[PDB]
Design a protein around this ligand. Structure first.
Ligand SMILES: Nc1nc2c(ncn2[C@@H]2O[C@H](COP(=O)(O)OP(=O)(O)O)[C@@H](O)[C@H]2O)c(=O)[nH]1
Ligand SMILES: Nc1nc2c(ncn2[C@@H]2O[C@H](COP(=O)(O)OP(=O)(O)O)[C@@H](O)[C@H]2O)c(=O)[nH]1
Ligand SMILES: [K+]
Ligand SMILES: [Mg+2]
Ligand SMILES: [Mg+2]
Ligand SMILES: [Mg+2]
Ligand SMILES: [Zn+2]
Lengths: 136, 299, 99, 131, 244, 230, 337
RNA sequence: CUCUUAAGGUAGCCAAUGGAUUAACGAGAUUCCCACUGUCCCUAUCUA
């Protein structure tokens, strides 16, 4: 489930394969994040690594501060547009795919998160829940 | 600073390293080639043999070279300690021998791949590959003594205590058999031996404690004799270098009952002789074994 | 050294309040809290903790704690009562109301 | 299902909602903030010439004027007249939080409504003057 | 009266727990070790309640309250609300709040008398806070940092703010809250102090990674032990100079 | 732990209670285990085991001989002690090498219809100031990787081998064509620079060029070995 | 030996060079500590503020693009060694705008060490892109090392053709024992070797293009009955002091395959004069590279769908113009003595 | 007998311009970007 995550993770429908671009939901100055790798991904021929809500990816900043650009950093997905099933009894989805920039220990670079944050991601990552103002 | 050098991989000797690399080549590369195959296939087979063996030797040498500390680039206290323990000249010479052997192996591999590009028969390609491997083996066999020295040095240096030269430090010094190790046992949880004969402690020992929510390290040193530096030996040089380098609070221990085997005049003389060592450091003189004789009832 | 001055001052200073109103804000400590006896891990007569109950029953990951045992209800027989939720397509919770 | 509806109303191509636009138009301060925006290079017209009703940026003042002289803007204005259909409307239609919905409708009629209408009239005359 | 523990090898105590003067809330995940760690210090004097908020374990981040009231977000289910009501005595009011900022623990930093709130909460939410918690309400940031409930730890005795708070802001917030405030870190260099620890007028709980100088500063500012006021800063100045 | 903590632990706590007996029994089983390894190991491991056993036996016999010999019981100056180190050629006849083995046919053209270029497959010496001829006129090809400049020359007197530069190819025994092409095969007479050997004639002239004969196959072993003709 | 130095059988017990006295020892240790602290501060200025801090956040710099490794392939360098081995005269072609930048010093050292009989000269091409005095100063400075000829390559309107031809005739007469001589043209890509050969022949015999790697194999051109010319692919010697920005600005890589040219645009700003840039692009009023790109895009109509300016496309066009000579610029020659 | 390093401070003299770095056109050959998408992840369904 990755280093820094709080416990095990149940399966969520994958919406972001490698090569996807998502928004940046923190206040570190990055505008978008380009997914190049998914942490904890398995191995199968011809299959692209994909990430869901609450996953950690390796991303490069495409738009934002030039100091943040041209570097690879860990990110945590906090919103996805692909619908997924909650065990309470509903399928649901967000407007956009959005992630936040973090460290290998799962600590946010920014100080706050704009927009809603998924319940699964907030429960899996304590620092995301600490920096979230809206949790679903 | 790194402060600890235990994570150095095992250094095999010359014959064992040769066996490891050559048998890895024989196992991990294909071994069946036929004289009826194409000359391009035969040449590629023997080129792969030479290149893989060269890469194995080079990666072993690089694992040796990266692991060991740089004696000149570390803090001067650690540099002096490792010079006293392992003879910095021999240290650098052995590591330079390893580096030169790596360069020679790379050159042999490149030259013999280039020569194997022009092989005309399986016999000739086999001879060129055997020549390349034999030259690599001669280069490795020339490293018999530095590899053994480096393995011994690695085993010793992995067990050295970690000393931070910039933290809060209490040095303990004096003559043998005065109670330095006993005081270290009293104030810390170090397992230094306490025995009633001189030089039970042959190396620096470290303990730790907490005072006012701050971590302090206490250093027990081997005994120092009242001798000039020209006839001073390495065991005493450890203590001398520790006192000279570690900006700290030095505690000079004195025995007034002379059960340590040294007179009070000799202890005072040793204190005045090591007086130039503690400049711009805190100094305190601790009179031990007061349960035997007190400073008040002295002559 | 003058470099470690401003940061040291800003981290050593303790801000103090000053009046702003004549309203008394006193710390609250319950009488049971201040009469509570200190817990001793090595004591023959100590309180039986929840982890002790868990260890004696099933251990961690096997013991099923009854969350209704701590309910402060008018009748103690009402603790293990199943509260109805759905009746004929209506939620009972938004009809539940005194008087 | 069909290609036209899919490629118009895909999730990633969603537009701002009527209740949010109504809340934006209700207060004069929000109207002033949307009229005076910082110069953004990622928006058409440097973030200027923004129609609040349609939530749409224009590249030029003439483009904004032609948009105002159009049936699409009139359709949006006609849509933004009544109650913005929050969740309370559907709840009260089902028979849930009826008093809350009635109080919300009364507050919209009494306080929010006329102030929003006056703000819309002020925005209209300001656009007419500046255009 | 400052202890160290972890919730499943995590130092973020304030994320998974809520502590007031009259009750304690703990997450239901896993074993009973976290509950027993709170119970060793609290006894049976105040109720300690296993609870979930919207099926999650982040109850200190999702909820906020003091000795008189407890506010839960709109995602709290009727069953969770009923469980909280059945577990707690009548002297603690319980309210479900229709607020866009559902992370009440992040957006509200309160004690028994004062409250700092996010500058963008609803007016009805502010009035509900004043009615239920019975406290004065101020819209504030901790030196430009929103989420005051996660970046400040507050009790009736003192307060701990994140170390990037300026001296002028510390003075202004101390005047607003009528308690002494100090800037410091918890959990060995973490700046999220409110999510790092829980505290009341007689108990503080931090993570295992919290160092001795940090614990000493926490005890000094929250006045936990009998001989630990807020004026021992002069005595701990040498230790703090060495640490910083 | 610090310094010799395992030795200190042995000194302060001892070892396991069955350590001595277990070690003694393992060393007693060692003979059976050696025999079973010799009879059971197959292939490369078995060959290596037999080779190592032979080497150990030779070493043991030499040690026994040295002990028995011990129990039974150049006229250099002062500054040199305590310091250590017919006109027939040595190879009058070598293996003949045909032109088919010596040259490799190189084909040119889009359909590879032309076959006039020949590449020399042996090692060559091209001398100083060598520039390749233009490719349109280059019939004989001597690739650069096969060009040699130095050789390991062994002096019969004093028994030393020195890496010396090559001066000329005097005689290739196969053909004068190969001699003038500079082919370096076995039995070839070459001229080498002997400046570092410090040879002086009877008249006081310093010798810096002599003749040597190639004694190996450089196309086989990648290097040129020669014996100085003295 | 090592065995006596350290180990079970060690016999060393005292330092080899014992200290004279404790005062000298403490003075030496204090000096060593001071030097160590000064060195630590000197490396904390750059390396610790750089590489060391990045691993704390887990950040890693992006992989270096392979488009910057062009000119360093084994096939190209085999071709280079082939043309050198076949050449009697070697002409090193330099760009008049950056002659020290476009020099193959390692190749020159190899030629002067291993092939001293091959004659190496300098041709300073594209002298029409620099002022007259700049070209004269560069010729004077480079003549202190090697015979340097100023040149401007063109089939119709060229400069230096007769001088190069008479110098080659001098070389041919010097090597009169040889039936012919070969002159191989080496240097950086896009310096104009094929253009110089076409200028000498007064005919387009070698392919010429601004794109790097237009010439991929060697080519023989008969200039006279006794003179052959060898066109060679461009080479970029590997180095550590030369960065990706320098490699890009030496006209070495294809701009279409770089990731972010907007970060290289400040290099254009630092290398070009403000007056020259504003005359070329008919714009002004910028305060940084982003403003320059935005103003140029809005003036030229390079807008993406939705009004966004095309930063990457404008940056690529600017870099192409800089490399291909639609913007005037040069590197100052060394000062006169 | 002799030959080449005199040119100098971001655009010169010398004869609008100093040009083939040639507009336009092209089922000519090549590279890249936006948009777009079942090319792909990863395949499913419908009609003749
Ligand atoms: N009576 C007495 N004996 C001591 C005291 N300290 C040390 N000793 C004795 O001194 C002997 C050796 O002391 P030791 O700790 O090895 O001193 P060191 O050689 O400087 O490390 C031990 O056998 C102890 O019994 C003390 O305070 N009182
Ligand atoms: N202004 C100017 N441009 C030149 C000159 N020589 C070459 N060029 C240009 O440089 C570009 C690349 O030249 P090219 O001969 O292909 O470089 P190569 O890689 O060395 O062969 C061509 O488009 C030419 O127009 C010169 O003397 N002056
Ligand atoms: K080119
Ligand atoms: Mg595949
Ligand atoms: Mg001792
Ligand atoms: Mg070319
Ligand atoms: Zn409109």
């Amino acid at each position: 489930s990755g280093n820094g995550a709080q416990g095990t993770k149940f399966r969520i429908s994958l919406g972001l394969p490698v090569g996807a671009i998502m928004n940046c939901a923190d206040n570190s100055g990055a505008r978008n994040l380009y997914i190049i790798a998914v942490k904890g991904s398995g191995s199968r021929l011809n299959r692209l690594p994909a990430a869901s809500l609450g996953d950690m990816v390796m991303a490069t900043v495409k738009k934002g501060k030039p100091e943040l650009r041209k570097k690879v950093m860990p990110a945590i997905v906090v919103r996805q547009a692909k619908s997924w099933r909650r065990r309470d009894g509903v399928f649901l989805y967000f407007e956009d795919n959005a992630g936040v920039i973090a460290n290998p220990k799962g600590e946010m670079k920014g100080s706050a998160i704009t927009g809603p944050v998924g319940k699964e991601c907030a429960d899996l990552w304590p620092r995301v829940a600490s920096n979230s103002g809206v949790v679903v | 600073m790194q402060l600890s050098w235990k994570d150095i991989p095992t250094v095999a000797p010359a014959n064992d390293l040769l066996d490891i690399v050559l048998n890895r080549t024989q196992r991990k590369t294909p071994t069946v080639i036929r004289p009826g195959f194409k000359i391009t296939r035969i040449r590629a087979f023997y080129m792969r043999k030479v290149k893989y063996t060269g890469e194995g030797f080079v990666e072993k040498f690089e694992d040796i070279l990266k692991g060991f500390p740089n004696i000149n680039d570390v803090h001067p206290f650690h540099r002096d300690l490792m010079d006293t323990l392992y003879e910095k000249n021999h240290y650098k010479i052995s590591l330079a021998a390893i580096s030169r052997a790596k360069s020679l192996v790379e050159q042999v591999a490149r030259d013999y791949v280039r020569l194997l590009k022009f092989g005309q028969s399986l016999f000739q390609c086999k001879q060129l590959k055997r020549a390349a491997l034999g030259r690599m083996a001669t280069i490795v066999k020339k490293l018999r003594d530095p590899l053994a020295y480096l393995e011994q040095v690695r085993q010793h240096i992995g067990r050295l205590p970690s000393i931070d030269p910039n933290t809060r430090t209490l040095l303990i010094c004096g003559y043998p058999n005065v109670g330095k190790s006993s005081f270290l046992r009293c104030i810390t949880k170090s397992d230094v031996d306490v025995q009633p004969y001189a030089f039970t402690t042959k190396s620096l020992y470290v303990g730790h404690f907490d005072y006012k929510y701050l971590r302090f390290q206490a250093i027990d040193t081997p005994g120092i004799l009242d001798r000039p530096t020209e006839e001073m030996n390495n065991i005493e040089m450890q203590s001398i270098y520790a006192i000279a380098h570690l900006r700290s609070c030095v505690l000079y221990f004195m025995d007034l009952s002379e059960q340590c085997g040294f007179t009070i005049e000799a202890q005072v003389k040793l204190f005045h002789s090591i007086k130039p060592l503690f400049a711009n450091k805190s100094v305190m003189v601790v009179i031990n074994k007061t349960d035997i004789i007190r400073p008040e009832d002295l002559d | 050294s003058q470099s470690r001055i401003n940061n040291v001052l800003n981290k050593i200073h303790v801000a103090q309040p000053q009046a702003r109103d004549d309203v008394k804000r006193t710390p609250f400590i319950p009488e049971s809290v201040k009469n509570l006896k200190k817990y001793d891990p090595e004591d023959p007569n100590r309180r039986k903790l929840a982890r002790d109950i868990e260890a004696e029953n099933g251990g961690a990951g096997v013991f099923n704690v009854n969350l209704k045992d701590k309910y402060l209800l008018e009748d103690d027989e009402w603790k293990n009562d199943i509260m109805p939720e759905i009746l004929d397509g209506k939620n009972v919770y938004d009809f539940l109301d005194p008087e | 299902m069909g290609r036209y509806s899919v490629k118009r109303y895909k999730t990633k191509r969603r537009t701002r909602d009527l209740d949010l636009i109504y809340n934006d138009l209700s207060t004069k301060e929000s109207v002033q903030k949307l009229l005076n925006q910082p110069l953004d290079e990622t928006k058409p017209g440097l973030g200027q010439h923004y129609c609040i009703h349609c939530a749409k940026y224009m590249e030029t003042a003439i483009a904004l004027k032609t948009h105002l002289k159009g049936k699409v803007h009139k359709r949006r204005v006609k849509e933004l007249r009544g109650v913005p259909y929050t969740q309370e409307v559907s709840d009260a239609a089902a028979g849930y939080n009826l008093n809350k919905f009635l109080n919300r409708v009364q507050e919209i009629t009494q306080s929010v409504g006329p102030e929003k209408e006056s703000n819309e009239a002020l925005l209209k005359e300001h656009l007419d003057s500046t255009l | 009266m400052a202890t160290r523990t972890q919730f499943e090898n995590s130092n973020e105590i304030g994320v998974f727990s809520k502590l007031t003067n009259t009750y304690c809330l703990v997450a239901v995940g896993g074993s009973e070790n976290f509950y027993s760690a709170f119970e060793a210090e609290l006894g049976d004097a105040i109720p300690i309640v296993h609870t979930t908020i919207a099926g999650t374990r982040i109850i200190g981040r999702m909820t906020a309250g003091n000795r008189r009231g407890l506010l839960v977000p709109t995602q709290t289910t009727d069953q969770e609300l009923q469980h909280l009501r059945n577990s707690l005595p009548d002297s603690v009011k319980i309210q479900r709040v229709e607020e866009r900022l559902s992370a009440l623990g992040n957006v509200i930093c309160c004690n028994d008398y004062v409250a700092l709130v996010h500058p963008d909460i609803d007016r009805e939410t502010e009035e509900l806070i004043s009615d239920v918690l019975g406290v004065e309400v101020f819209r504030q940031t901790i030196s430009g940092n929103i989420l005051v409930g996660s970046y400040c730890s507050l009790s009736n005795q003192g307060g701990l703010v994140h170390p990037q708070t300026s001296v002028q802001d510390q003075e202004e917030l101390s005047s607003l809250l009528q308690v002494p405030l100090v800037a410091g870190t918890v959990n060995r260099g973490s700046s999220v102090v409110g999510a790092g620890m829980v505290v009341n007028d007689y108990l503080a709980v931090t993570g295992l990674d919290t160092t001795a100088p940090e614990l000493s500063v926490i005890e000094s500012i929250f006045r936990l032990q009998d001989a630990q006021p807020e004026s021992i800063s002069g005595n701990l100045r040498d230790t703090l100079i060495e640490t910083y | 732990p610090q310094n010799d903590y395992i030795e200190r632990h042995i000194k302060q706590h001892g070892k396991r209670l069955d350590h001595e007996e277990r070690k003694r029994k393992r060393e007693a089983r060692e003979s059976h285990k050696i025999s079973e390894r010799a009879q059971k190991l197959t292939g490369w491991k078995g060959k290596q085991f037999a080779k190592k056993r032979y080497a150990e036996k030779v070493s043991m016999r030499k040690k026994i001989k040295a002990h028995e010999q011990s129990k039974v019981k150049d006229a250099l100056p002062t500054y040199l002690l305590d310091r250590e180190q017919k006109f027939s050629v040595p190879l009058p006849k070598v293996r003949g090498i045909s032109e088919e083995e010596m040259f490799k046919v190189i084909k040119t053209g889009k359909s590879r219809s032309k076959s006039w270029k020949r590449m020399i497959t042996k090692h060559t010496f091209v001398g100083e100031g060598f520039t390749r001829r233009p490719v349109k006129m280059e019939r004989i090809i001597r690739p650069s990787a096969l060009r040699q400049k130095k050789a390991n020359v062994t002096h019969p007197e004093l028994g030393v081998t020195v890496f010396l530069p090559i001066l000329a190819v005097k005689k290739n025994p196969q053909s004068p064509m190969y001699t003038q092409l500079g082919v370096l095969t076995k039995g070839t007479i070459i001229e080498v620079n002997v400046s570092e050997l410090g040879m002086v004639t009877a008249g006081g002239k310093v010798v810096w060029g002599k003749y040597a004969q190639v004694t190996n196959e450089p196309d086989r072993d990648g290097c040129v070995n020669a014996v100085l003709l003295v | 030996s090592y065995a006596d130095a350290f180990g079970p059988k060690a016999q060393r017990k005292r330092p080899r060079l014992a200290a004279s006295n404790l005062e000298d020892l403490v003075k030496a240790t204090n000096e060593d500590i001071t030097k160590y602290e000064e060195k630590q501060v000197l490396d904390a200025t750059l390396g610790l503020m750089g590489n060391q801090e990045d691993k704390e956040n887990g950040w890693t710099s992006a992989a270096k693009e392979a488009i910057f490794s062009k000119g360093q392939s084994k096939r190209i360098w085999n071709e280079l060694y082939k043309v050198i081995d076949s050449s009697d005269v070697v002409i090193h072609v330099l760009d008049a705008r950056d002659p020290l930048g476009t020099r193959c010093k390692s190749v020159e050292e190899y030629m002067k060490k291993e092939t001293p009989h091959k004659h190496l000269i300098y041709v300073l091409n594209k002298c029409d892109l620099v002022p007259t005095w700049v070209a004269a100063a560069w010729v004077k400075h480079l003549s202190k090392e090697r015979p340097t000829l100023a040149f401007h390559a063109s089939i119709t309107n060229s400069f230096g053709k007769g001088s190069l031809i008479q110098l080659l005739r001098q070389f041919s007469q010097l090597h009169t024992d040889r039936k012919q001589i070969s002159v191989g043209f080496i240097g950086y890509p896009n310096t104009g070797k094929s253009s110089i050969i076409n200028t000498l022949r007064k005919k387009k015999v070698c392919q010429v293009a601004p794109i790097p790697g237009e010439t991929k194999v060697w080519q023989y051109i008969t200039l006279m009955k006794r003179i052959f010319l060898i066109d060679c692919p461009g080479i970029v010697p590997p180095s550590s002091k030369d960065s990706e920005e320098d490699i890009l600005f030496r006209g070495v890589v294809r701009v279409e395959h770089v990731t972010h040219p907007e970060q290289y645009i400040p290099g254009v700003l630092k290398r070009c004069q403000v007056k020259h840039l504003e005359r070329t692009y008919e714009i002004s009023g910028w305060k940084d590279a982003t403003e320059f790109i935005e103003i140029l895009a809005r003036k030229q109509g390079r807008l993406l769908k939705g009004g966004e300016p095309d930063e990457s496309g404008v940056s690529k066009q600017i870099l192409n113009d800089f490399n291909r000579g639609k913007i005037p610029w040069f590197v100052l020659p060394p000062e006169k003595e």
